[PDB]
């Protein structure tokens, strides 16, 4: 085979996103408690807390929390090696500054981890994906205050002791790079949780917030290996390279700066220093940061093992906009479509070849072990009165992806950990809080109004991905 | 009230031995490749002769005689205000067939005495170790540096420079432009690169691979005793960079780019990480490509990383995936690449992008977080004196202008780390790839035709005054 031997096929999930019983067992409020139900060109309202009238999808998302024993019998079923799922911050410490965690939320995870384990599918752990205690963000502001960093420095301690011999694979931050795009609410509330008000330099506080975020995974990856040295700590960005539309010297310019600006959080994690150009644009922009000599001593001693990342899309980027005279990245705005691609029905272009791109740019920057920690596509999916979803199109595309990152492996070189698809059992939307935008190989009775059995079903891609797993790669 | 770029940042101009110095055979110099080339045209190439041959113009001979200039060379230098000087070390002035137990005196000091020259006028110098003018006895006896054992003898040659010269020269590189050879279609750059003389029926990439691997190794090497030596030496590597843009944003041209930019510039993540990027072990599977390749330089070569990434600018190429049966995108450089629609060029087709040195900049900056040095620049055109007895370069000016602008922005709003700029040919000479005297780089004309006939009669270019006020005033003035 072209994959190595333990190659670690999985699915990955979130917390939020699909464990339902969103107060079960003391559980606190979390940001993804208070934002309601959206859809493709509308945005998801972020509410003062628990409002009437409004919608709030991940309450009670798929009831996975009530469920678990039978799904993850399904993931082995297709035979997973490994499964990715993050520790609910709010299951641990409800508020966030508790003193001591909650016990019975620690024993959800003991049960869900020895569930996999039964199977032999290892977990793979995100410490914070979208999900900070709402505490924390009316009580202190969220990650714009540095004594959240101990806050979540007191989380992940808690977790790596009691799961020290359990998970080998472990995440600080989901996605850490999306605040990349501070001009709309989502990544910055969600990331970090901050809640924006008049006045405020959107960026000036995205830069804070990331940076203590950034100084609270090198002291987490620090505080993992000393418990248990042989613990695999990495960090986890959303890639989605950035292409210059033509080879105008400018669009170069253009793609090269906006890709350093996206990606500076990734050198940081693995060179443990932020780069030059960083601090140049945070003097141009009259931008302080709060970054003192210990910080500057963790980030150097807390680089990471390895990288995961997500992938669905890559952008093209041109210098159309004039007034940009010093080449910044407005997400916003300077991106333009790729000619040569199809899309989604969300419109998030669907190229393959980007992940041997990505793959072969994160080996060449940084030379560390590579982990797909997401990667899937979201449509709308029919019932067959067969009673199946036929989901080809879903299948061709994690197929395709496939087909690339072995090519990346096999002609490249890269070290590749795994390959965990996304969203592995339908589940509530990050982006939309959408219920038809189904990602999974398991088709869960549910809709975009919550109503439904709730019943769980394979889709034609169950067995298809079955047979992946099974053939190491060899039969797509 | 500072400038956007450091008090002691190092300007300077740069040239190589062969191409100015003569006197080929003064002092026991031995013949070297450039002594067996002949005269070419744009578009002829020069003539790799089988030893020197009656009846054939060798330019390299007596170029500019600077051999015997230098000290009033030296002194225009100090003229403009020279921060630093950058040449090359002539491998057959010191070794003339490269493999003798014991240096050349004559040669060592002839070298004492052009870095005691700068010196005196507080000129730094910036030499390079190998500039395409290794010992042609390499080449017959040995096979260049396809043998293993020729690894040592420039070792040893490195050794007696850094040993000489080791309170004198401050700044090192290794290996002229050693990615040229990149381009093994060609006989030129694996001829000068690595004293290659290829035959019918070679596997010419294969074989470029492995002098390229030995060289790796003996930079290195080189690295490692010129530090035992004395550890405040910055000693660097030296690569050309010619930045690869894909035509457009189609998946399959990007690819191109990437791993365009992976094959022509894998020397500088071993000069610089110490090991090869897996990608190119893979590559030498597909091919079947067998590179002699021992424990020992695994050792050395993580051993002997460079200080610095010294580097040449000139241009930026454009690729895509237009040719047809590349399955595994590998890179031909005489048939991948694509004029840029953007951009301009000289009149030897050299496209014109100062902006690509700001990109090139940021490319080295991002991969490798190491300092910088720009240690050639420049703009080879057609000069012709006017009837004030000068040339009137406002072409050369501006191109230069243009490069010097782009490269602040780097340092002063990108915060790369760049020691200095070196303009190439800063005095008028004999151009590499084409043999010519009529290329003109120079800040200062040197009479000189390309039948061989002229007074040799140095004097200022407009661009010399331009250059002198760019220095004074720390590029605050352009
Ligand atoms: O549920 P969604 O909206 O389809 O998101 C998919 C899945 O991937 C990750 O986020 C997806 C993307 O959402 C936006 O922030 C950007 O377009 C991207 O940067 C980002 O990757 C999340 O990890 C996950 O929770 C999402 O459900
Ligand atoms: O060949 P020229 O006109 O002298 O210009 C090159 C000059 O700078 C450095 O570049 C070498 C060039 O040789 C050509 O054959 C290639 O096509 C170019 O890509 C390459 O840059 C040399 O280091 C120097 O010796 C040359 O004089």
């Not at 490994?82 to 641990?92: K, L, N, V």
């Not at 993992?224 to 960005?237: E, K, R, S, Y």
Request: charge should be negative; include cysteine; glycine fraction near 8%.
């Amino acid at each position: 085979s072209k994959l190595p031997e333990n190659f670690l096929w999985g699915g990955a999930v979130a917390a939020h996103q699909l464990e339902g019983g969103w107060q079960e067992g003391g559980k606190g409020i979390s940001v993804a408690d208070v934002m309601t139900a959206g859809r493709h060109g509308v945005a998801r309202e972020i509410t003062a807390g628990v409002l009437e009238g409004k919608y709030y999808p991940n309450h009670e998302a798929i009831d996975f929390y009530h469920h678990y024993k039978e799904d993850v019998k399904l993931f082995a079923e297709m035979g997973f090696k490994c499964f990715r799922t993050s520790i609910a911050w709010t299951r641990i410490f409800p508020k966030g500054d508790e003193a001591e965690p909650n016990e019975a939320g620690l024993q959800f995870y003991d049960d869900l981890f020895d569930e996999c384990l039964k199977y032999g599918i290892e977990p793979v752990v995100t410490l914070s994906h979208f999900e900070l205690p709402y505490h924390l963000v009316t009580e202190y502001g969220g990650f714009t205050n540095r004594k959240v960093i101990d806050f979540f420095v007191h989380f992940a301690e808690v977790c790596f002791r009691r799961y020290k011999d359990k998970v080998k694979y472990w995440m600080t931050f989901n996605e850490i790079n999306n605040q990349a795009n501070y001009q709309e609410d989502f990544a910055p509330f969600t990331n970090s949780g901050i809640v924006y008000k008049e006045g405020d330099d959107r960026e000036a506080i995205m830069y804070q917030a990331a940076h203590y975020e950034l100084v609270a995974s090198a002291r987490a990856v620090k505080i993992g290996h000393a418990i248990n040295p042989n613990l695999n700590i990495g960090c986890m960005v959303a890639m989605c390279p950035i292409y210059p539309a033509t080879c105008n010297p400018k669009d170069i310019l253009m793609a090269q700066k906006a890709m350093q600006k996206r990606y500076y959080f990734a050198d940081v994690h693995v060179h443990g220093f932020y780069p030059e150009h960083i601090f140049k644009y945070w003097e141009r922009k009259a931008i302080k940061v709060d970054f003192t000599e210990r910080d500057k001593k963790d980030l150097f001693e807390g680089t990471v093992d390895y990288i995961g990342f997500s992938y669905y899309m890559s952008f093209v980027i041109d210098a159309h906009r004039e007034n940009n005279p010093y080449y910044d990245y407005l997400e916003t705005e300077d991106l333009v479509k790729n000619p040569y691609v199809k899309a989604s029905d969300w419109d998030w272009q669907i190229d393959p070849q980007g992940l041997r791109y990505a793959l072969n740019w994160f080996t060449d920057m940084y030379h560390l072990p590579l982990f797909i920690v997401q990667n899937g596509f979201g449509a709308i999916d029919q019932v067959e009165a067969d009673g199946m979803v036929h989901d080809d199109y879903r299948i061709d595309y994690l197929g395709a992806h496939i087909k690339e990152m072995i090519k990346a492996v096999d002609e490249d070189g890269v070290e590749l950990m795994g390959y965990t698809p996304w969203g592995c059992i339908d589940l509530v939307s990050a982006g939309t809080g959408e219920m038809r935008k189904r990602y999974g190989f398991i088709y869960v009775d549910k809709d975009d109004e919550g109503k439904g059995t709730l019943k769980r079903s394979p889709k034609l891609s169950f067995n298809w991905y079955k047979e992946v797993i099974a053939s190491n790669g060899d039969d797509i």
